Scaffold this active site. Structure first.
Site, PDB file in Angstrom:
ATOM      1  N   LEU A  10       0.873  -1.285   0.015  1.00  0.00           N
ATOM      2  CA  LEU A  10       0.025  -0.133   0.076  1.00  0.00           C
ATOM      3  C   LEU A  10       0.924   1.334  -0.111  1.00  0.00           C
ATOM      4  CD1 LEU A  10      -2.800   1.177  -0.047  1.00  0.00           C
ATOM      5  CD2 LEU A  10      -2.711   0.945   2.293  1.00  0.00           C
ATOM      6  N   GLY A  11       1.372   1.548  -1.086  1.00  0.00           N
ATOM      7  CA  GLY A  11       2.157   2.673  -1.625  1.00  0.00           C
ATOM      8  C   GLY A  11       1.757   3.601  -2.679  1.00  0.00           C
ATOM      9  N   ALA A  12       2.629   4.488  -3.145  1.00  0.00           N
ATOM     10  CA  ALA A  12       2.254   5.313  -4.101  1.00  0.00           C
ATOM     11  C   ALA A  12       1.523   4.741  -5.253  1.00  0.00           C
ATOM     12  CB  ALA A  12       3.404   5.993  -4.544  1.00  0.00           C
ATOM     13  N   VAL A  13       1.873   3.766  -5.783  1.00  0.00           N
ATOM     14  CA  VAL A  13       1.092   3.155  -6.996  1.00  0.00           C
ATOM     15  C   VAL A  13      -0.091   2.622  -6.592  1.00  0.00           C
ATOM     16  CG1 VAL A  13       1.550   0.854  -8.285  1.00  0.00           C
ATOM     17  CG2 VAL A  13       3.515   2.360  -8.195  1.00  0.00           C
ATOM     18  N   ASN A  33      -0.066  -4.853   3.540  1.00  0.00           N
ATOM     19  CA  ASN A  33       1.427  -4.010   3.676  1.00  0.00           C
ATOM     20  C   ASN A  33       2.272  -4.755   4.877  1.00  0.00           C
ATOM     21  OD1 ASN A  33       2.544  -1.643   2.198  1.00  0.00           O
ATOM     22  ND2 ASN A  33       3.393  -1.367   4.401  1.00  0.00           N
ATOM     23  N   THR A 148       4.160   8.667  -9.471  1.00  0.00           N
ATOM     24  CA  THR A 148       3.416   9.276  -8.229  1.00  0.00           C
ATOM     25  C   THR A 148       4.244   8.909  -7.101  1.00  0.00           C
ATOM     26  OG1 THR A 148       1.396   8.037  -9.513  1.00  0.00           O
ATOM     27  CG2 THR A 148       1.261   8.388  -7.096  1.00  0.00           C
ATOM     28  N   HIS A 213      17.658   2.327 -18.158  1.00  0.00           N
ATOM     29  CA  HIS A 213      18.536   2.335 -17.159  1.00  0.00           C
ATOM     30  C   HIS A 213      19.688   1.538 -16.996  1.00  0.00           C
ATOM     31  CE1 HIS A 213      15.146   4.261 -14.023  1.00  0.00           C
ATOM     32  NE2 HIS A 213      15.404   4.890 -15.164  1.00  0.00           N
ATOM     33  N   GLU A 358      17.070  -1.589  -8.050  1.00  0.00           N
ATOM     34  CA  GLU A 358      16.114  -2.240  -8.573  1.00  0.00           C
ATOM     35  C   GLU A 358      16.358  -2.641 -10.164  1.00  0.00           C
ATOM     36  OE1 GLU A 358      12.455  -0.132  -8.455  1.00  0.00           O
ATOM     37  OE2 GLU A 358      12.009  -0.925  -6.608  1.00  0.00           O
TER      38      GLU A 358
HETATM   39  N1  LIG Z   1       5.933   6.458 -10.124  1.00  0.00           N
HETATM   40  C1  LIG Z   1       6.254   5.256  -8.950  1.00  0.00           C
HETATM   41  O1  LIG Z   1       5.646   5.605  -7.765  1.00  0.00           O
HETATM   42  C2  LIG Z   1       6.773   4.214  -9.760  1.00  0.00           C
HETATM   43  C3  LIG Z   1       7.321   4.412 -11.031  1.00  0.00           C
HETATM   44  C4  LIG Z   1       7.832   3.102 -11.702  1.00  0.00           C
HETATM   45  C5  LIG Z   1       8.049   2.147 -11.042  1.00  0.00           C
HETATM   46  N2  LIG Z   1       7.882   1.900  -9.650  1.00  0.00           N
HETATM   47  C6  LIG Z   1       8.043   0.820  -8.689  1.00  0.00           C
HETATM   48  O2  LIG Z   1       6.774   0.338  -8.207  1.00  0.00           O
HETATM   49  C7  LIG Z   1       7.230  -0.041  -7.025  1.00  0.00           C
HETATM   50  C8  LIG Z   1       6.360   0.413  -5.937  1.00  0.00           C
HETATM   51  O3  LIG Z   1       6.487   1.928  -6.120  1.00  0.00           O
HETATM   52  P1  LIG Z   1       5.682   2.669  -5.197  1.00  0.00           P
HETATM   53  O4  LIG Z   1       6.044   4.231  -5.288  1.00  0.00           O
HETATM   54  O5  LIG Z   1       4.456   2.246  -4.791  1.00  0.00           O
HETATM   55  O6  LIG Z   1       6.579   2.261  -3.495  1.00  0.00           O
HETATM   56  P2  LIG Z   1       6.109   2.930  -2.043  1.00  0.00           P
HETATM   57  O7  LIG Z   1       5.220   4.015  -2.132  1.00  0.00           O
HETATM   58  O8  LIG Z   1       7.390   2.754  -1.125  1.00  0.00           O
HETATM   59  O9  LIG Z   1       5.354   1.591  -1.806  1.00  0.00           O
HETATM   60  C9  LIG Z   1       5.510   0.247  -1.850  1.00  0.00           C
HETATM   61  C10 LIG Z   1       4.653  -0.293  -0.517  1.00  0.00           C
HETATM   62  O10 LIG Z   1       4.993  -1.624  -0.632  1.00  0.00           O
HETATM   63  C11 LIG Z   1       5.268  -2.100   0.736  1.00  0.00           C
HETATM   64  N3  LIG Z   1       5.972  -3.206   0.590  1.00  0.00           N
HETATM   65  C12 LIG Z   1       7.182  -3.486   0.160  1.00  0.00           C
HETATM   66  N4  LIG Z   1       7.536  -4.810   0.192  1.00  0.00           N
HETATM   67  C13 LIG Z   1       6.438  -5.485   0.282  1.00  0.00           C
HETATM   68  C14 LIG Z   1       5.994  -6.836   0.578  1.00  0.00           C
HETATM   69  N5  LIG Z   1       7.195  -7.808   0.196  1.00  0.00           N
HETATM   70  N6  LIG Z   1       4.929  -7.187   1.167  1.00  0.00           N
HETATM   71  C15 LIG Z   1       3.713  -6.355   1.344  1.00  0.00           C
HETATM   72  N7  LIG Z   1       4.141  -5.055   1.265  1.00  0.00           N
HETATM   73  C16 LIG Z   1       5.313  -4.543   0.523  1.00  0.00           C
HETATM   74  C17 LIG Z   1       5.822  -1.070   1.156  1.00  0.00           C
HETATM   75  O11 LIG Z   1       6.123  -0.794   2.836  1.00  0.00           O
HETATM   76  P3  LIG Z   1       7.371  -0.587   3.308  1.00  0.00           P
HETATM   77  O12 LIG Z   1       7.962   0.741   2.863  1.00  0.00           O
HETATM   78  O13 LIG Z   1       7.314  -0.908   4.803  1.00  0.00           O
HETATM   79  O14 LIG Z   1       8.264  -1.674   2.588  1.00  0.00           O
HETATM   80  C18 LIG Z   1       4.977   0.030   0.697  1.00  0.00           C
HETATM   81  O15 LIG Z   1       3.952   0.230   1.600  1.00  0.00           O
HETATM   82  C19 LIG Z   1       8.637   0.091  -6.656  1.00  0.00           C
HETATM   83  O16 LIG Z   1       9.405  -0.819  -7.054  1.00  0.00           O
HETATM   84  C20 LIG Z   1       8.863   1.416  -7.744  1.00  0.00           C
HETATM   85  O17 LIG Z   1      10.461   1.272  -8.095  1.00  0.00           O
HETATM   86  C21 LIG Z   1       7.187   3.052  -9.064  1.00  0.00           C
HETATM   87  O1  LIG Z   2      14.566   7.377 -15.474  1.00  0.00           O
HETATM   88  C1  LIG Z   2      14.305   7.890 -14.180  1.00  0.00           C
HETATM   89  O2  LIG Z   2      14.559   7.041 -13.279  1.00  0.00           O
HETATM   90  C2  LIG Z   2      13.251   9.196 -13.954  1.00  0.00           C
HETATM   91  C3  LIG Z   2      12.621   9.768 -15.080  1.00  0.00           C
HETATM   92  C4  LIG Z   2      11.825   8.937 -15.823  1.00  0.00           C
HETATM   93  N1  LIG Z   2      12.128   8.113 -16.851  1.00  0.00           N
HETATM   94  C5  LIG Z   2      11.641   7.041 -17.511  1.00  0.00           C
HETATM   95  C6  LIG Z   2      12.284   6.290 -18.593  1.00  0.00           C
HETATM   96  C7  LIG Z   2      12.589   7.266 -19.914  1.00  0.00           C
HETATM   97  N2  LIG Z   2      13.587   8.312 -19.618  1.00  0.00           N
HETATM   98  C8  LIG Z   2      13.597   9.240 -20.685  1.00  0.00           C
HETATM   99  C9  LIG Z   2      14.582  10.188 -20.327  1.00  0.00           C
HETATM  100  C10 LIG Z   2      14.260  11.638 -19.465  1.00  0.00           C
HETATM  101  C11 LIG Z   2      13.240  11.493 -18.705  1.00  0.00           C
HETATM  102  N3  LIG Z   2      13.438  12.693 -18.019  1.00  0.00           N
HETATM  103  C12 LIG Z   2      14.344  13.480 -18.484  1.00  0.00           C
HETATM  104  N4  LIG Z   2      15.047  12.746 -19.469  1.00  0.00           N
HETATM  105  C13 LIG Z   2      14.090   8.427 -21.766  1.00  0.00           C
HETATM  106  O3  LIG Z   2      14.945   7.673 -21.631  1.00  0.00           O
HETATM  107  O4  LIG Z   2      13.662   8.739 -23.002  1.00  0.00           O
HETATM  108  C14 LIG Z   2      11.253   5.783 -16.382  1.00  0.00           C
HETATM  109  O5  LIG Z   2      11.917   6.021 -15.409  1.00  0.00           O
HETATM  110  O6  LIG Z   2      10.410   5.106 -16.650  1.00  0.00           O
HETATM  111  C15 LIG Z   2      10.508   9.551 -16.393  1.00  0.00           C
HETATM  112  O7  LIG Z   2      10.572   9.989 -17.679  1.00  0.00           O
HETATM  113  O8  LIG Z   2       9.626  10.185 -15.685  1.00  0.00           O
END
Ligand SMILES: NC(=O)c1ccc[n+]([C@@H]2O[C@H](COP(=O)([O-])OP(=O)(O)OC[C@H]3O[C@@H](n4cnc5c(N)ncnc54)[C@H](OP(=O)(O)O)[C@@H]3O)[C@@H](O)[C@H]2O)c1
Ligand SMILES: O=C(O)CC[C@H](N[C@@H](CCN[C@@H](Cc1cnc[nH]1)C(=O)O)C(=O)O)C(=O)O
Ligand SMILES: NC(=O)c1ccc[n+]([C@@H]2O[C@H](COP(=O)([O-])OP(=O)(O)OC[C@H]3O[C@@H](n4cnc5c(N)ncnc54)[C@H](OP(=O)(O)O)[C@@H]3O)[C@@H](O)[C@H]2O)c1
Ligand SMILES: O=C(O)CC[C@H](N[C@@H](CCN[C@@H](Cc1cnc[nH]1)C(=O)O)C(=O)O)C(=O)O
Lengths: 425, 425
Positions: A10-13, A33, A148, A213, A358
């Site tokens: 239960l996080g941002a997503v 969570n 988010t 990445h 990651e």
């Molecule tokens: N814009 C985004 O938000 C975005 C974009 C692209 C990719 N992602 C990826 O999506 C994934 C989640 O992103 P998020 O922003 O929602 O992170 P977040 O706000 O930190 O939420 C993750 C939630 O899941 C809990 N959690 C982690 N491991 C767990 C498990 N094994 N079982 C149950 N709960 C667990 C976490 O609690 P704890 O904090 O206590 O561990 C937290 O509440 C991340 O890997 C992120 O890199 C996110």
């Molecule tokens: O990459 C990060 O960790 C944070 C920025 C994030 N990236 C995307 C991948 C695409 N990245 C652009 C390049 C770019 C984005 N902002 C300035 N330049 C590209 O490769 O075409 C992601 O992560 O899903 C986003 O776009 O929001």
């Protein structure tokens, strides 16, 4: 068709997903969570009447809304068989652990499991942990469809979405799956276009950070910034010496895309045209920088032209070319995304940021999986080695006692073997 | 020896050259500048006891100094046969007018004439305009050896030098000419290496402006900025949409370099390696951006690789990569040179800035010369046509009545015929 939905993690997503589910129409909304400080803050906020609260920034204001959480759990063993749909909103590295920890033998009512950020093999990995005869369909989304963040950990259920993606892809473990259309509609409410594809790996193969990445943030320049303590952090998408983008990094990007594309073919998935995917699904540039014919023809252009085109793309995006010009003729500094760097956690231990931890874990799994298809992935292995060497030197310097164990060496071969077994089944 | 030296044109170049000449020493130093507001201000400054002042910017501060001028003329009628060396510091597109206008009947003692910023054919053109039996040797310097500007035109004798070339080239109409070594010494005083070459055209073929300004500042983008009144002016060395650099501009650069190289061969001059010339003689970048092997091998790399490398070079110079980083990790914004634009003169007539009027006039003369060697130079002609079309539309819009005649079609064929006849003699 969604029934009662359990959000795992239960996080941002999850908060964004919850509001999209509520716009579409669903039953009860629950969340799982795992224990920790965040769960403690959530439980107190809920006790004081908090709800899930989503704010859309700027032109995304229409996304904003509230939604009640009907059930909150921390312990998977405490789940009742009351959930038709599970949405995994945890880090993708945690999908296997999450699935292994659920009491599936008494969750027979689960019909759908959605993986929001599915890497190549994630669907298969998840299915390998399910019991025989489990009737759950597993869905793979190519990546999370927005940007988010929980603004303030003190208001733990309030999230801000600042952007929504143009396009994502959705695949299913069930051939010609109908749950794809339901989730296509759900996510379309946010403005993202969901493109259903015929298999999970075709969607997993369209995860953008795998292609971007890996070459840029597992290399020497990025790791030097990420592991640094003093000085400016540098910028993720600038050219050397301000950022990591060099002709060498672009060569790594091209070669890795070739390697990933052949893996996808061996798994039965059509690979992507990298330049067209980046331009059309992520961020476009003007015809005078990338002609449409060059974009569409990229996969057949030959390695030198392909690298030139990719370098042009990232140079063209040092600014946002479609932003308004200022009074000096300058455009928005799109590439000035600072590197997040290592930081000590609440136990005093150095931790890496999600970029690149990651990204390294995902690529390590993909390389281990590819070995089963007799693919050596030399470029991928070089990127893995670059990360491993740099992090190892950081441990040498700081001391293992000062470093969080997530920095220590991992082994993805057991998960790769489970994926391959499931795929051959 | 240089003897008594007359500077022809007394602007920014002349002030830098005067400093270097006074260091070397031993002659009277005079200057001639045609009548006008600048000459009026110069005479006023000298009459109040002012001297020529050269300031070096930043790293170049060591160059700063003062140089006395013995005589200044804005009336050629006052000149007498007192001068052994003439130094032409006027715009290169005025060399023919300026040499015709000198009072050669009172300059029989002149032994050398130096063209400080030559171009292919300039030496021959100047020789064609000398009086019969004139036995001044004409020297061609490849490029002006610095970047220098008069800071404030109300102090016309004070100039700022902000860059110094690593290397320039010097040819002479006399074979095995001993004056080349003299000028090697003079310029070495400001840190420039002068490389003597065996003919004038070999040196003229190393004029940097011809290779860079022609593709970049005769194109649509540049002309739109230059002929504008209302916009921000844009930046000369930035990427589209902030500046004119695009893959198409880079292709034009490569193709023009090929055309110019063939002309040089037909005139018995060895062409240059464009990338090595730009990097090593003008402004370098790091090995990770331009590997030494790529620089040295450029001329054999093949068109796609050549264009990629040229693009990388200019993207790498959007900042000065060897400048110090600021608090945020940013380097000096080297590419933020604003376009100078059209402006009305004291008669109310629009005038074009030297970029690109001088660049157009030079390239038009070179194309006309090349026709005598049966070289069509299509890329050069496409750049000429781009300029001509843009300026023609500006005249259409503003009104011929309002435009200085320098904006109008010219005929370079007479000058090209004179050059060719001189070459064949
Ligand atoms: N814009 C985004 O938000 C975005 C974009 C692209 C990719 N992602 C990826 O999506 C994934 C989640 O992103 P998020 O922003 O929602 O992170 P977040 O706000 O930190 O939420 C993750 C939630 O899941 C809990 N959690 C982690 N491991 C767990 C498990 N094994 N079982 C149950 N709960 C667990 C976490 O609690 P704890 O904090 O206590 O561990 C937290 O509440 C991340 O890997 C992120 O890199 C996110
Ligand atoms: O990459 C990060 O960790 C944070 C920025 C994030 N990236 C995307 C991948 C695409 N990245 C652009 C390049 C770019 C984005 N902002 C300035 N330049 C590209 O490769 O075409 C992601 O992560 O899903 C986003 O776009 O929001
Ligand atoms: N860093 C540089 O300065 C630089 C860089 C690259 C190339 N160059 C080359 O050096 C040349 C001179 O540069 P600069 O910066 O010294 O220019 P400048 O400061 O404008 O001085 C040029 C001098 O020549 C006079 N002049 C201009 N047009 C003339 C004409 N048609 N006939 C006779 N005299 C004329 C000018 O006097 P009025 O103003 O009264 O006409 C002025 O005294 C440039 O045109 C270029 O070929 C210079
Ligand atoms: O007007 C200014 O400040 C510059 C003036 C001048 N330009 C040269 C051409 C070479 N230009 C650089 C690129 C560059 C220069 N400054 C920022 N970028 C390159 O092509 O390698 C000339 O006019 O001949 C100089 O550099 O001395």
């Amino acid at each position: 068709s969604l029934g009662n939905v359990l959000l795992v993690g239960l996080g941002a997503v999850a908060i964004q997903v919850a509001l999209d589910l509520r716009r579409h129409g669903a039953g009860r909304l629950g969340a799982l969570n795992h224990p920790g400080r965040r769960s403690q803050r959530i439980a107190e906020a809920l006790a004081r009447g908090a709800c899930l609260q989503l704010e859309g920034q700027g032109q995304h204001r229409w996304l904003s809304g509230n939604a009640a959480l009907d059930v909150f759990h921390q312990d998977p063993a405490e789940l009742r068989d009351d959930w038709q749909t599970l949405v995994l909103c945890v880090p993708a590295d945690s999908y296997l652990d999450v699935v292994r920890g659920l009491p599936w033998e008494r969750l027979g009512g689960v019909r759908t499991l959605l993986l929001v950020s599915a890497f190549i093999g994630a669907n298969l990995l998840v299915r390998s942990a399910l019991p025989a005869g489990c009737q759950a369909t597993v869905l793979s989304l190519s990546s999370y469809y927005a940007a988010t963040k929980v603004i303030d950990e003190t208001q733990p259920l309030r999230a801000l979405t600042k952007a929504v993606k143009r396009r994502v892809y959705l695949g299913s473990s069930r051939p010609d799956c109908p749950a794809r259309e339901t989730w296509r509609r759900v996510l379309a409410g946010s403005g993202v276009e969901v493109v259903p594809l015929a298999t999970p790996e075709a969607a997993e193969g369209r995860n953008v950070t795998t292609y971007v990445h890996s070459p840029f943030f597992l290399g020497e320049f990025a790791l030097a910034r990420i592991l640094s303590e003093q000085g400016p952090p540098g910028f993720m998408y600038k050219l050397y010496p301000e950022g990591p983008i060099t002709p060498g990094a672009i060569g790594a990007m091209r070669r890795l895309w070739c390697e990933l594309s052949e893996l996808l073919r061996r798994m039965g998935a059509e690979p992507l045209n990298l330049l067209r995917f980046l331009n059309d699904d992520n961020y476009p540039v003007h015809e005078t920088m990338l002609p449409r014919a060059s974009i569409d023809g990229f996969a057949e252009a030959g390695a030198e032209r392909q690298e030139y085109l990719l370098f042009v793309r990232y140079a063209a995006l040092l600014v946002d070319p479609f932003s308004p010009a200022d009074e000096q003729g300058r455009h928005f500094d799109f590439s000035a995304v600072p590197f997040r760097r290592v930081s000590r956690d609440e136990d005093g231990l150095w931790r890496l940021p999600r970029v690149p931890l990651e990204d390294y874990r995902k690529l390590a799994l993909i390389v281990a999986l590819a070995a089963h298809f007799d693919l050596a992935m030399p470029q991928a292995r070089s990127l893995l080695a670059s990360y491993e060497n740099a992090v190892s030197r950081f441990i040498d310097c700081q001391g293992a006692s000062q470093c969080h164990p997530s920095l220590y060496p991992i082994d993805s071969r057991p998960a790769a073997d489970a994926i391959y077994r499931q795929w051959c089944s």
